[PDB]
Amino acid sequence: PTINQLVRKGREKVRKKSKVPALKGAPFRRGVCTVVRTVTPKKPNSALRKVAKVRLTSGYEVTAYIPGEGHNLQEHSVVLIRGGRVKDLPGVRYHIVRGVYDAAGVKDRKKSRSKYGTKKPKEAA
Template sequence: MAKTLKHFHINCSLWRNNFLQFLHERGGPPKRRSRSNDKKPISGQSCFKGIVLKLVIRHPKKPNSGNRKCAIVRLSNGKEICAYIPGVGHNLQEHSHVLVEGGRRRDLIAVRANIVRGKLDCAPVKGRK
């Protein structure tokens, strides 16, 4: 039993030395890629103009319930995102021009933008000042 443990530790130390030698020859560990810009369709901009491709209804995560109105929007930079339509009621249809700002909806999966009400083709919320 003790003999096998001894061989195990020798093998581990040899493997570690080989790995460190490999990293040294390669110039260190590989550089980690920043994924922050890949994930954000609205990267560094306050808002983008876009065209509504499709209106969808999303269901929130637990413990919330209800139907949330969203739109699949093609932004002016060519990316497609799912954007939340805030407020009660809306007049959006396919091919409507909308202004999209960043900001995620925490109870909806993969919704990382909001449509600005009262700009371009999206009417303001009725009954609000």
């Protein structure tokens, strides 16, 4: 590229793509949803994972997951489009929250209460 050619041309900036088009700057969204199902991760699992299709307040039928055991969710919930794929469900992108307008965590949870709902386990004793 011998200085000259480098100057004449340019070494272009990498750019991104956002492997996470939650879009608008909105990775928090009103997950309306439709369906539930199950699906499997590669050759060593099988579970649940929803599909929450969401519609946001901008579009997309995504694959909104869930923060795990203890479900209700039926068909609205405002599944809070969040973010993070794995080797499971060809998507796992834009997760759910529990708390939102619905779910509010595992019936009795003692740790991840930062999304898994349950307030402050006051056993009142």
